[PDB]
Design a binder for this molecule. Structure first.
Ligand SMILES: [Mg+2]
Ligand SMILES: [Mg+2]
Ligand SMILES: [Mg+2]
Ligand SMILES: [Mg+2]
Ligand SMILES: [Mg+2]
Ligand SMILES: [Mg+2]
Ligand SMILES: [Mg+2]
Ligand SMILES: [Mg+2]
Ligand SMILES: [Mg+2]
Ligand SMILES: [Mg+2]
Ligand SMILES: [Mg+2]
Ligand SMILES: [Mg+2]
Ligand SMILES: [Mg+2]
Ligand SMILES: [Mg+2]
Ligand SMILES: [Mg+2]
Ligand SMILES: [Mg+2]
Ligand SMILES: [Mg+2]
Ligand SMILES: [Mg+2]
Ligand SMILES: [Mg+2]
Ligand SMILES: [Mg+2]
Ligand SMILES: [Mg+2]
Ligand SMILES: [Mg+2]
Ligand SMILES: [Mg+2]
Ligand SMILES: [Mg+2]
Ligand SMILES: [Mg+2]
Ligand SMILES: [Mg+2]
Ligand SMILES: [Mg+2]
Ligand SMILES: [Mg+2]
Ligand SMILES: [Mg+2]
Ligand SMILES: [Mg+2]
Ligand SMILES: [Mg+2]
Ligand SMILES: [Mg+2]
Ligand SMILES: [Mg+2]
Ligand SMILES: [Mg+2]
Ligand SMILES: [Mg+2]
Ligand SMILES: [Mg+2]
Ligand SMILES: [Mg+2]
Ligand SMILES: [Zn+2]
Lengths: 142, 38, 175, 207
RNA sequence: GUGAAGAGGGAAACAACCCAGACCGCCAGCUAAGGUCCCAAAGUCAUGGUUAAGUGGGAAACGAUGUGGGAAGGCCCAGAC
RNA sequence: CGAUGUCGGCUCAUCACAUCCUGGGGCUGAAGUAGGUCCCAAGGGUAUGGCUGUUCGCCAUUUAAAGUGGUACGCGAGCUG
RNA sequence: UGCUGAAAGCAUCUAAGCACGAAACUUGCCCCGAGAUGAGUUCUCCCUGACCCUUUAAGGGUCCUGAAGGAACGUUGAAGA
């Protein structure tokens, strides 16, 4: 007997809110990636996103230990010849403070179509006020 | 400042100290004596 | 540790309020404030602020020594006030004060007019001398280092904004 | 904020010194304001201007309803200028030409004259090879556009043949020579972009 | 000895290095090399340390009051630095 | 080797830092000017001619300087030969 | 380069804290730019009819309607293969 395979028409999704005013970036992002792939759900399948929508309010006070707030650097290539742009942690915070959590979970998540779908279910905010209160999201200690 | 790769005290007034992760010799009297392990 | 062991004797006329990990101190020469480190316990032992580390840390005794020396400098500032002296040896190198700017004149074709911060006052009795009073030792050493940095004293003639508390050495202009 | 002129032609201005100034004659009609945008409504502080007069049987019903609700006469286009803090423009106002009664330098932005499918020698100022001395079918061609096998790709932004011009370009800090409040003229010095009949955004200078 | 004439698992990828010898089927279990935060199956497992360098995750002569451990010491409660 | 065309010139270049200028400094057997040497720094800039096939060179004359290297000793499905 | 400052009663630009510092990096100036699938924002204009069916669905077919606008054609352009 072919065991259970969760059909994407009948699987249901919840809504979670994560506080991030001092969580460590790597551990927080790993737990976001775990709930986003859906591995807290017993109807789990690889080829079907059984994930859960996660709203990370206050995504700029994510605290990083070590000397990483002045030493951890981020690289992205433009596409031209000399274009290797590079910004530290505090400078990436000062430019666009949600890109840090988005790059972290975009590193941890799978790659390709389903990985980009699981990332599409992750929307983060640099403040304390979201606009998805019509969804009834529940808080989650993560 | 001579940027040696082996700093070494050359009198009694010289003091070996550690700024920023490098070693330095700072002297009170002779500015030739001032060194830095780099 | 060793400086952190013998605590400071705060006299009368100088209030202190332990605002958790902040300390404020008030008096006749103005008030000061210092955010202490989060590994350092201070206490008010009714005429004396005693010191120790909060444990859970191994950076205890260095930080407690810094906290003791900072409160000592704060008490000395609020009850007496420091008074530094700079001077201008050279050819016509002349200063003046105008309330809170020090209109220097140091051979610079643009005029060097340094704007002094809040808790600092100055007086230039001799027109090659500056004497300035203050409460916060760090910022008055800062302003004195700024004025000495405007014209560092050379090793050939001793000109420039020479410290009156630190003499220098001058190389002979040989040949 | 700026004005939206139409570049008529270039001519001289003589002074009593005897100097000759290349003067461009930007006519500037009364620029109508159609819609003023603020933070709570829209997202920035900026106004919308229009000039001229289009045919009634050529302005479509969205544009005509936009202008008629805006409360001005049916113009000929739309442009949008940011508001430096200290300007509160009314939606019925009509920005005249006397805005430049105090400035000395303006920055003029317009569509440059499109010169076709211009090659490399005309476009990016390359050079040529020889016209004799053996040279065969290669008098004005680009030449080597890369290296051998590493990269193994023409690097992005390589200078090549394409369409020169017909693009918005901006000249910075041309001196205003005259402001004619009667003929509705702004007389600048130099070489502004665009041909006769081009539409030029004239702003007060930055540098 | 292995490849050649040998598949599989590991070392990201990587004939010869580590475990291992594929007769065929099974949506059964135990395990070796290697591993158990996430990509990626399994310990954000327990006990006690060490590191502050991203060392771990390329490296020498030589230099250094980095820091932890041991043992010997030579001045010192008649006053040591 | 059932083929990847091999020196130099032209035309395009792009990268590295072990920097030639410009920027910032520390020391000087640095009075000033001109310097010497060392540390950070690659954003831009970096010569015309005589002779040779030349790269290289020597030379004449400028320049703020006439960088050192890679890129199949870059570049012949682009060009002499 | 410093100011204050302890582990190290002194000293100390540093471990706590703060200030200064380059043509380098982020900006400021110019240009592209919502295919930015994360496809955004604001303004304006237009469509306000009937039934018929079975598997009832974000379903299909019929009669009337054809708006805003676009496209086509023509005269063309200091726009252009
Ligand atoms: Mg430093
Ligand atoms: Mg070295
Ligand atoms: Mg044309
Ligand atoms: Mg030529
Ligand atoms: Mg031929
Ligand atoms: Mg020909
Ligand atoms: Mg080729
Ligand atoms: Mg490739
Ligand atoms: Mg094998
Ligand atoms: Mg294998
Ligand atoms: Mg390997
Ligand atoms: Mg493998
Ligand atoms: Mg067998
Ligand atoms: Mg095992
Ligand atoms: Mg994979
Ligand atoms: Mg797992
Ligand atoms: Mg554990
Ligand atoms: Mg080593
Ligand atoms: Mg003694
Ligand atoms: Mg061959
Ligand atoms: Mg072949
Ligand atoms: Mg360098
Ligand atoms: Mg020097
Ligand atoms: Mg380069
Ligand atoms: Mg660069
Ligand atoms: Mg080369
Ligand atoms: Mg070679
Ligand atoms: Mg070659
Ligand atoms: Mg050879
Ligand atoms: Mg060739
Ligand atoms: Mg070729
Ligand atoms: Mg021949
Ligand atoms: Mg000091
Ligand atoms: Mg001290
Ligand atoms: Mg600063
Ligand atoms: Mg410049
Ligand atoms: Mg810059
Ligand atoms: Zn010395």
């Amino acid at each position: 007997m072919k065991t259970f395979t969760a059909k994407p028409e009948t699987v249901k999704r919840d809504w979670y809110v994560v506080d991030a005013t001092g969580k460590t970036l790597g551990r927080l992002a790993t737990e976001l990636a775990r709930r986003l792939r859906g591995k807290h759900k017993a109807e789990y399948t690889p080829h079907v996103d059984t994930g859960d929508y996660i709203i990370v309010l206050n995504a700029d006070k994510v605290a990083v230990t070590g000397n990483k707030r002045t030493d951890k650097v981020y690289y992205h290539h433009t596409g031209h010849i000399g274009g290797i742009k590079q910004a530290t942690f505090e400078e990436m915070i000062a430019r666009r403070p949600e890109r840090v959590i988005e790059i972290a979970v975009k590193g941890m998540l799978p790659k390709g179509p389903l990985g980009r779908a699981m990332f599409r279910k992750l929307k983060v905010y640099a403040g304390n006020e979201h606009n998805h209160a019509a969804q009834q999201p529940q808080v989650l200690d993560i | 400042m001579k940027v040696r790769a082996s700093v070494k005290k050359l009198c009694r007034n010289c003091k070996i100290v550690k700024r920023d992760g490098v070693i330095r010799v700072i002297c009170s009297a002779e500015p030739k004596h001032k060194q830095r392990q780099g | 540790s060793r400086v952190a062991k013998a605590p400071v004797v705060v006299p009368a006329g100088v209030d202190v309020k332990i605002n958790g990990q902040v300390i404020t101190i008030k008096g006749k020469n103005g008030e000061l404030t210092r955010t202490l480190n989060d590994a350092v316990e201070v206490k008010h032992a009714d005429n004396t602020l005693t010191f120790g580390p909060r444990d859970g840390y191994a950076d205890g005794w260095a930080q407690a020594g810094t906290a003791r020396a900072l409160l000592n400098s704060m008490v000395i500032g609020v009850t007496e006030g420091f008074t530094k002296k700079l001077q201008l040896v050279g050819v016509g190198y002349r200063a003046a004060v105008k309330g809170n700017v020090i209109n220097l004149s140091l051979g610079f074709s643009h005029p060097v007019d340094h704007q002094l911060p809040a808790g600092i006052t100055a007086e230039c009795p001799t027109q090659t001398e500056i004497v300035l009073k203050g409460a916060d030792k760090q910022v008055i050493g800062q302003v004195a280092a700024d004025l000495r940095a405007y014209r560092r004293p050379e090793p050939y003639k001793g000109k420039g904004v020479r410290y009156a508390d630190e003499v220098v050495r001058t190389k002979e202009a040989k040949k | 904020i700026g004005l939206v002129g139409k570049k008529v032609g270039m001519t001289r201005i003589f002074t009593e010194d005897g100097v000759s100034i290349p003067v461009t004659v930007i006519e500037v009609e009364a620029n109508r304001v159609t819609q003023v945008k603020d933070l709570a409504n829209d997202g920035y502080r900026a106004i919308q201007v229009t000039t001229g007069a289009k045919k009634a049987n050529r302005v479509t019903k969205p544009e005509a309803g936009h202008f008629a609700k805006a409360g001005v006469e049916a113009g000929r286009g739309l442009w949008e200028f940011r508001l430096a803090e200290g300007e509160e423009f009314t939606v019925g106002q009509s920005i005249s030409v006397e805005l430049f009664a105090d400035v000395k330098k303006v920055d003029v932005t317009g569509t440059s004259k499109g010169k076709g499918f211009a090659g490399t020698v005309k476009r990016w100022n390359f050079r040529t090879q020889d016209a004799t001395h053996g040279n065969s079918l290669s008098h004005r061609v680009p030449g080597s556009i890369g290296q051998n096998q590493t990269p193994g790709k023409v690097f992005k932004g390589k200078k090549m043949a394409g369409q020169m011009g017909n693009e918005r370009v901006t000249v910075q800090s041309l001196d205003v020579v005259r402001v004619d409040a009667e003929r509705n003229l702004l007389l600048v010095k130099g070489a502004v972009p665009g041909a006769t009949g081009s539409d030029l955004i004239v702003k007060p200078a930055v540098k």
